[PDB]
Design a protein around this ligand. Structure first.
Ligand SMILES: Cn1c2c(c(=N)c3c1CCC3)CCC2
Length: 58
């Protein structure tokens, strides 16, 4: 997938290694990272772009 800022996705939370819904807050194209915000949980963390999942994965 080609992701954009604001996209809904699912990501693997670094704390528990499980998949959750999130929104892309920003993308660093040089570093190939992004920051996601976990829906309903308020927190954010960086992900590798390559690691994001379809927003249907939950
Ligand atoms: C399940 N969970 C998740 C996140 C949390 N901050 C917290 C929980 C549990 C409490 C904090 C991020 C994505 C999933």
């Amino acid at each position: 997938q080609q992701w954009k800022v604001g996209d809904k996705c699912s990501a693997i939370w670094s704390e528990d290694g499980c998949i959750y819904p999130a929104t892309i807050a920003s993308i660093d194209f040089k570093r190939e990272t992004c920051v996601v915000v976990y829906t309903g949980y308020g927190n954010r963390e960086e992900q590798n772009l390559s690691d994001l999942l379809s927003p249907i994965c939950e």
